[PDB]
Write a protein that binds this ligand. Structure first.
Ligand code: NAD
Ligand code: NAD
Ligand code: NAD
Ligand code: NAD
Lengths: 338, 339, 339, 338
């Protein structure tokens, strides 16, 4: 059993824990979480884990003690008082193998190495990192991971959806250039009301309007697909929706492909080399049908449009549940190396 | 010389047209006057929905009622609303109505919309993409193509009044080879509040609980107002939990490789020149809340512009309710200037 | 040995009733089976609305179609939906339907609901307050008052199924002199997405853009299930931008002076004893998002309980879609046991 | 012109400034804002003031410089760098007479006295205070303010609505006791997603559910109406709405009155002693008709019900715009004593 410790038991931290529990019920997971770190007490963390506004209530019973939270008889050391850097957490004492860094403040590998120095064997950053050992999207460049990587980045949720769509289009037809627009759900980093913020777009009320923000999912596509480095760029549009997002990639193809050709190539890729990561839809679905869906990219074949050499591909993705299931699959791949 | 206007369908677009007409009269840039309104409800409900609005708030004028006419302020509008049959049953000729604004949504076909003309109307303006209409007009694009020989007039969609100025500037300055569109739109009344039956299984879902991808012909029928771009554009729509206010995201391949500053300066010159009042230039990090109750038909956001070689992505905001209705008022004044 | 059920109105309550039946069948506490569903749409839209739900997510079972029948998983439900007329036109006897769950909302009057009985149904359950019905039953309150001689059975409001357990515990333990309630309800399909015509000018406004205060007969008609409280209770409703999930706030004057701890202890004993399955006791800081997809009729929130002398305010949550539909499942199983 | 300095240019602060500008356009205002403090640069404050998600765009042009933000012909020194206590802000150097405390962290008069030490003549806290000189609700106990008060508070947004309703009910029929439930708009103190918070109820997603929270609006009614001290109590329920709230007071009356009697007493009070504070409405209005309404209490006569002596009175109020107009009117009343 791979011992995992979460740093930042927020939305992604609790989604990773719930996806790990669901994947253990499905049998495709072996790691267990033994520690969680956050800037709050165990009572608040246990209440936020039991009652979720988006994922509902947890089927297991959740209890507390004095420093640990008890779920299904299992116990997780709520080592949350560590308000300093990641090197202050006692991962070595708890025997934690893989650490899921999900605070949002330690995206730099120079800082993210504090987990490794504290006793951890490997670190998985749940966001685009800097100076990281490798940026992995499960199903795209997961084969490029040997045993010589410790600061591993699962990239962004948008990157985990754009990479499969761009991989199929480039490997089957070739990508000359593309511009994407991900229509994203609002996240905790936005303001509920009009208040100060480093981003004047996300400074506005998140639930009252649509805030166009930036993203590095397309500009950093070379981190997982080096042949597409500098060929993609785009931004994001935060809509009043809790979870569930969609990517709208408009790309010029090297070879002219029809709508039927692109849809047939995505259907064969979803049921083959990308089975479990990419899913093919021929049904008129909405984002409510994407909430709690573990797939990284949900290709919507109905919204495909092609003129001459320019093609628009639309693919859904759950920014919380789908990305956390990839963090579970990545923690299992790294745990297989430990 | 006041043009007499009659509204068929006093819904969201109908009341926004009356409010934009009243606001343009207070500004002095309007001469038409609405004299009649028809719906499928009594005059008390129409007067209440006009006074109290969830998006535009309360009306600054007092609103009263009688038995067959609704009185705003020093103004009387014959609430000829009992006419629930075809458009020919309405007494447009008896009431002396010059221009009829069709805003019900069920009379988009010019074959049925011709009943207004048979009923005594001089010109008919459909507030939606029509079929077999005399002309499809987008103010600021092909408004000059309207002479005196048109009676069944149409004003295209809310999305079209935003895409057309953006594609016109890009083609006149850099040339458009082909482009694809995704308009992020506010939800409209034709959507269901909860999951219920609907001809569109996408719009059948809860409008405020998710994003419904639906189809649109704004880009596919761009040749109706820009024949040089006919068949060069296509796209769809994505309804989001917002009452009013939408945005268009056009990714287009250009004939000539242009820079970000070139595209922004070209749109800025158009907004300050030939498209003053139709296109607006924004160099500030704005959001859709700033677009609510904005009379412009296309609000170009220069900060969201991106380009790769010749492929450019242009983002432009527009209020699908207020901005479109102000264009309907300007179109009614243009039609009144002919007859 | 399986009681055959047919749903008239496969809307929100209709699909929630079918999903609650399937979940109760997987738990083993249900024997009735739904064999027919009538709606104003084809079987394709019915299967799509059943498979994909905006609140309840996707169905774990696979859903297929044919030409007139929608196949769940192994089971087939005749989508007898062409019956767009009154409830007497549906062929319940030809389909062999024993109990009919009326959930269209347009056939709440017993003069219409009797059409199911004339069509071959043995018993009818209206998922709403009815007029001139045989009996109005709230499970856990007056469920004993049902003998074999009732056919026009009506389950009360979702608000009544939450207010009745509160008023029952308060009256049986402390006595109720008078009370005034205010239920904070989620928006429902009968409201408008934008400002449009409606019989209720309050519910005529945009449901998700504001809070619409509407009236309700939940508290005024409590005497139908507790005669000792007839006329002693009254209240209204306040629709808030929420898909599913509501809460009741009952301010009641008690006959005997009781403390906050005494009221919470009596409700905790009732939830753990006489009202196990209908009333739930919560000592955790819960919100309405913790109430969605909860089968309990009333979820008493002990933290929000307050009293001043003999005036007490009791707060209890309830899921107006899922929790109410489970009570329709239990009522259909009880009536099916009477056959 | 009364010199005013804002400490906390957030939602309430910018609502106070916009209400001051609108009241100056109406002609019934003389105060002028000269400073603003907000733990963010002048550029973010100028952008948040020009563009509002609820109040729309500002009709005046808004520009910036290096430390001051320009309205139109008016320049306001954005003294926002004062990140320490209120005693460190230079109110005396700028010549500010009255200071509007709107941060929410200096409600206690022990810390709020820093404004007076910094050179301010009077202090107006935009929230319930502790150890304050006097708690004033305009239209109720505003006459109890002489020149011998320096640290004044305007109570809560809910109190400014319950006080007129409780005053009319007590002066006409008498109040034995009452329990209220204010259905409130969500505010900045709530979380957008499920995250840690001092209040586990307000820790949940504010826009995805209703958060029941406590309030001292009814419990502290004795600060402005001593005869009702301890006779009123209630809580709050935050609903997914940006601005605009409503109070639902169920109160036992000393004399059994009818629905027509209570509605007639409220109509005469709104047309008499409470003209400008209480609004009477006979139309089926909703909260969208209450947004941006300067009244302190909008009595809805249609939602009134009675049985014996227990009556339920419903009154709307805009927690943002209406409360800020009461702050503007209070600043004009306090400035009249200088
Ligand atoms: N859908 C998504 O939200 C999503 C998707 C992909 C990636 N990510 C990335 O994952 C990370 C987490 O996202 P989220 O939405 O769950 O964020 P969140 O704000 O909901 O949770 C972040 C957590 O960090 C905690 N934290 C803050 N300071 C800390 C400290 N000093 N030590 C420990 N914990 C601390 C917070 O208290 C909170 O629990 C971010 O980097 C985000 O960009 C998020
Ligand atoms: N809503 C927008 O932003 C927008 C933008 C562009 C175009 N449009 C189009 O404009 C049209 C109207 O839009 P809306 O939002 O005002 O629609 P709506 O459904 O909100 O209002 C339509 C009105 O027509 C009335 N009506 C129904 N049947 C009628 C009949 N037989 N005779 C007369 N009146 C009748 C209805 O009662 C209602 O008042 C539609 O075609 C719509 O697609 C809407
Ligand atoms: N929504 C709730 O939470 C809730 C709770 C308790 C009771 N109810 C009651 O349920 C009924 C409405 O259910 P709902 O609001 O959940 O969903 P809904 O409005 O979708 O239910 C009605 C359904 O009946 C269908 N239908 C079938 N035959 C029909 C016919 N001949 N004419 C018209 N429609 C027909 C409609 O198409 C629709 O799908 C009302 O009686 C309401 O008071 C609803
Ligand atoms: N929100 C309402 O509707 C409402 C109504 C009545 C009273 N109030 C009360 O008014 C106060 C402010 O409410 P709000 O909604 O404007 O709050 P907010 O959090 O939205 O805004 C407060 C502002 O204070 C600024 N600020 C200045 N100095 C600060 C410092 N040292 N530390 C942190 N922030 C600092 C913040 O940057 C922010 O802009 C609170 O006491 C609140 O309870 C609010």
């Amino acid at each position: 059993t791979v011992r995992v410790g979460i740093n930042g038991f927020g939305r992604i931290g609790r989604n990773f824990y719930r996806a790990l529990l669901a994947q253990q019920e499905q049998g495709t997971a072996d790691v267990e979480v033994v520690a969680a770190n956050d800037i709050t007490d165990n009572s608040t963390l246990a209440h936020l884990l039991k009652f979720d506004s988006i994922l509902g209530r947890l089927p297991c019973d959740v209890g507390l003690e004095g420093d640990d939270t008890i779920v299904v008889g299992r116990a997780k050391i709520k080592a949350l008082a560590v308000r300093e850097g990641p090197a202050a957490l006692p991962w070595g004492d708890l025997g934690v193998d893989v650490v899921v860094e999900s605070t949002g403040l330690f995206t730099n590998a120079a800082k993210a190495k504090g987990h490794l120095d504290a006793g951890a064997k490997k670190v998985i950053i749940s966001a685009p990192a800097t100076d990281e050992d490798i940026t992995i999207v499960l199903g795209v460049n997961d084969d490029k991971y040997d045993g010589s990587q410790n600061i591993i980045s699962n990239a962004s949720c948008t990157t985990n959806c754009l990479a499969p769509l761009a991989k199929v289009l480039d490997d089957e037809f070739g990508i000359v250039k593309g511009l994407m627009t991900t229509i994203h759900a609002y996240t905790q980093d936005q303001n509920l009301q009009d208040g100060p913020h480093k981003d004047l777009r996300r400074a506005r009320a998140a639930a009252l309007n649509i805030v166009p923000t930036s993203t590095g999912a397309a500009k950093a596509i070379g981190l997982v697909m080096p042949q597409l480095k500098g060929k993609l760029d785009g931004y994001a549009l935060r809509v009043p929706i809790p979870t569930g997002s969609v990517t709208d990639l408009t790309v010029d193809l090297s070879t002219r492909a029809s709508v039927d050709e692109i849809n047939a190539a995505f259907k064969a890729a979803a049921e083959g080399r990308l089975k479990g990561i990419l899913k093919y839809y021929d049904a008129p679905i909405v984002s409510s049908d994407i909430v709690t869906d573990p797939h990284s990219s949900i290709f919507d074949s109905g919204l495909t449009k092609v003129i001459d050499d320019q093609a628009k591909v639309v693919s859904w993705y759950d920014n919380e549940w789908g990305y956390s299931n990839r963090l579970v699959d990545l923690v299992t791949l790294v745990g297989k190396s430990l």
